[PDB]
Symmetry: D3
Subunit: 227 residues, 6 copies
């Protein structure tokens, strides 16, 4: 049947009902295919070295996620990436977790949304062969409201298409779209966030005034993709 | 400043993060206008006499809502409508709650989405003067992803436009759209619902297999609008 | 690996390069999945009993198809259905060919575009259990330019969704859309048709002035879906 | 009545049913206006000097067209452009053929699609006066699925608008879109192509493995528009 | 060159800058084709017998047009239609004016917008042969913001397409859309109208409270298309 | 009630009925809110120092506006800005008129379309604090056909959102869109312009051949936003 473990790399600024729902979606999919059984889901907040704009320090991110998942029987956080001194290429993170498992072989597979995927085209953001290796040796599960675009994008690229049998596009009927950005912005304006993220999360947020604008100013100088 | 109390009539089949979020939205709005202060929010599940398709029996609806709101300091359920033997015209429900308050006068105002509003045009669904009275003597707060349409619709009708100063369209940035229907359908197929509704709710649902299809067959014969 | 035989029932008024391309698309898909091997394709024109508007006599339809396929190694016509006295439900046609094969068991699968699919919703056009049996015991392969729509349509139905794992939506990159309707029209107005249909067809058409308008008037009275 | 000859310059990498259909469309239009009589159509593959990416050697391009036109009574190929040692501006080619005819004067008219037309705005791609001369002394026939855009395009340009009476936008009902790019891609992937291009063409292609990807890498360095 | 007269039949409830602009557009087009010379334009308000909803008495309609055209060198009103005691089919009015001219023969051509044209499909609204005659013996000039639609519309109709050479679609860049309906509504609501209609018109309207709503209730019972 | 004076800064190249209608729309809104009373409207053409492309000399702009407003009871031109030696920041112009009023305090408010608004995002075009002061101490009234966009734009910005209660978006039902650009263009090609601009304007334009193309070439070098 092939046990699987879904890895989700991402900034995970304010983790939100969405990211949680993604896991719900991906699972129901693969389980529902018959050729799979989802064993566990891993959230892996990016390190601070990633240096993206408005990226608050990892502790908060890892914490929030954990709080976020406290009540889940299959999704657990995982801090290895957030502690590295140097930013980690997704490929390396995937390998890591796979190698770990090899110490009855659940395949690790990259969980993701459209953006990630489409970001494959950003110049210098990815190592051509990184993409290859990823798609080739570890699956890629993409859950989106924008099914078609995702599928064109694949059609559009020889590398992806060649390994399309390892890429699954999961349709998000019922619109999520609770983007980190919109959530931060709300916070910044004293809006509400309630119901868009898990309570403990909200509460962790409000008692700690985590998102400000002083915060959004963070890292106003080139991310760690430029090699 | 004018204290206000938001009344939300609706089937409230599976109440969901959305309906809860609506209240969050409406409040933040009126409070943010300065000319208002939201005092309390009321959920009022429809009676069974409404006889709409797939409408499971009220007990469940009222319960679920309550569970739904257990943790809210300002939104409370209210069962008066669900007990009436005859289906109640929204106008009558509004009056009720207003009259109740008159026993320092918080104005009751109808909380709602686009559908409701647009349903004003369905033939025989509303008593022309009911609309009038509603809009005239009690406000109408409409939160939507479809701001424009809502505003055209108003522009489109002399009755509404005339009382437009009592109608407020609230823009839903960050897409909700967790419709009851999609949730039921999911349930029916053993999907997940998790994160789209409050846990106690989910749990109440799963321990009780509330939505089936046998259930959706309910009331396959003309609703209570036809007078 | 599972050998497969693609069955395409359809009026096949002027068969056109589209029809032919669908088979080419369908096959490349299945074969390209690894779980399949496309063995042969069958074109089965409707009988005259179907009584659809502008449906010229089977003889012309059957022949044109044959000419159309004369040069194909794997797609052949089949006249069983065009001969029956009474219109035949697609489920019966599927059964027929499957049973004939059972006289090493290639699964017959229904080749299809969106229209047919989406017509499962027209009232009285299909016997609910027919759809079910179809999708359950024989696959459904649907090639379209409208991927998402088709997928929504599936999402939108308990029956289909349930048997989703036997329904494949094949995306048609590169627009076809040479509808029979459009070609009839053209013919009617002395346009061209060349390069939209196979030459032998074009030729058979022009030497026989097959489509007129007197012809389009054919069957101006209720098709044979109405039981 | 004014006899006309339609000239189509273009890379004509895999010539396809589309290209052929264009002629059939343009003709029908002009002839159907009553002001014109289409005498002959000319295919003129671009030279190798053009230095476009993935542009395979001319001889293949010319041969394939010739096979594609073998059975046409009025569309013939023309190799004068493919033999030039320096890339030829479309204006020169137009003159060429016109001059040729002047040795009862059929007007040569440029046949094209939207992209060509829209390329008039690309910086440095065209000599302003070249555009002028073309549109002024030789017509421009543009068949498109994107009628409106084409017409805005004209509206938005003083030069074109001024000579609008010599520009005809021919609407393509029934979708073509068999782009050479799409074809090449398919070929690379072992797809089908059958029924997108004329048979002799496909055969010529299969028996010669003409498109590979090593081929697509051809000319990875600035085309000969930059003067 | 063929001199032409543009005739516009229409309710012309509040005539507006739009109506006037139409003429200016149509003219510019025909004159700009070189095949034509626009001699005069005629406004012909419909009679009261037409029995359209909200159709105020003709005299007001005719007067307002006249004021609206007072300062035009070529567009004049024409009251023959407004005096008839029975509603007149557009075809009869076209004949009328043509006949008139025949007492050097300027062709009368119907000036209109999309809706009119598109109304050709409304059941029972038009006598099939009426359409025929109109389009065949008198041209049809259609200015629209919705160019494409208009052109599909023609493509989709055998009758129209056959006479397409007598139908001209004139594209309206720069949005009009000052619909009489919109105007009336405004008026009812005490809005503005200024700069949507000619000043003498607005003044005529203000000094006469012409549009009320009691007025809009006019003719609440089937127009005179139903023969 | 709060008296108000609507200030509209703009190039006012050919002033057009649109410009005039904006004032009509703006006023009906404010007055129709009850919280306001529109006292006067001011048109303030830009100085020549602005140095925008195709900006003909202030004299013509100022005069045309005056002619345009000659017949208005409440909208008057104002030449203060056109006279200054140096281009003037809109904030200064707002201040000026406000200060002049303070010599019973009518609030001056900036009248505006979407473009201006949306240009708050162009880099270096506006001084962040200028926007702030503007929105904070002087309102911003924006009439558009693109309501939502405008509202999103607001949503999308901390600064604007913060002072949202002083920004009103007025919806323009009935399409205007007579852009100066379009009219210039037309003029350039001898089209018409009649009914899009006030007659006295049209007249002043045609007797003076104001717009040419030599004129459009004016200022082909960097506007005065670049500080
Ligand atoms: N070349 C690469 O492997 C590469 C480049 C950019 C981002 N990433 C990743 O994608 C992420 C960014 O997504 P978010 O911005 O939603 O967090 C990361 O989590 C991250 O590690 C990987
Ligand atoms: N004439 C009326 O007042 C009228 C008609 C139809 C529905 N309703 C109401 O709108 C509702 C239906 O909305 P839902 O179907 O989302 O529950 C009700 O809750 C209900 O009471 C009122
Ligand atoms: N209930 C059925 O089995 C059923 C109903 C309608 C059409 N069909 C068929 O599938 C076909 C497709 O028809 P068209 O491709 O001409 O629309 C038919 O030829 C047809 O007979 C089957
Ligand atoms: N000044 C000119 O005449 C000029 C400029 C750029 C391209 N072209 C041409 O238009 C062409 C279009 O070719 P493709 O559509 O296959 O790229 C060419 O074949 C070509 O030579 C002409
Ligand atoms: N058979 C006919 O000639 C025929 C049929 C229906 C409407 N019409 C007409 O076209 C018109 C359009 O008027 P409105 O656009 O204001 O409704 C009429 O004025 C009218 O009389 C003509
Ligand atoms: N920073 C500023 O105050 C600023 C910047 C750009 C334009 N504007 C102005 O507002 C105006 C609107 O310009 P347009 O209406 O011609 O695009 C101007 O006339 C103009 O000067 C002001």
């Amino acid at each position: 049947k092939t046990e699987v473990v879904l890895l989700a790399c991402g900034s995970f600024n304010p983790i939100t009902n969405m990211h949680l729902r993604l896991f719900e979606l991906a699972k129901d999919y693969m389980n529902g295919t018959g050729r799979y059984t989802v064993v566990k889901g891993i959230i892996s907040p990016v390190g601070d070295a990633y240096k993206k704009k408005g990226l608050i320090p990892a502790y908060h991110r890892v914490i929030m996620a954990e709080l976020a998942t406290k009540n889940s029987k299959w999704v657990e956080v995982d801090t290895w990436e957030s502690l590295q001194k140097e930013w980690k290429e997704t490929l390396k993170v995937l390998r890591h977790h796979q190698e770990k498992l090899e110490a009855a072989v659940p395949k690790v597979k990259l969980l993701c949304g459209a953006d990630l995927l489409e970001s494959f085209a950003v110049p210098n953001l990815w190592k051509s062969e990184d993409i290859t290796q990823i798609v080739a040796n570890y699956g890629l599960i993409c859950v989106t409201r924008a099914g078609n675009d995702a599928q064109k994008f694949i059609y559009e690229s020889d590398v992806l298409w060649k390994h399309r049998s390892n890429i699954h596009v999961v349709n998000e009927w019922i619109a999520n779209d609770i983007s980190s950005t919109k959530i931060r912005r709300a916070l910044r304006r004293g809006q509400s966030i309630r119901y868009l993220v898990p309570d403990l999360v909200q509460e962790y947020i409000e008692k700690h005034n985590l998102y400000s604008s002083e915060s959004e100013d963070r890292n106003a100088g080139v991310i760690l993709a430029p090699l």
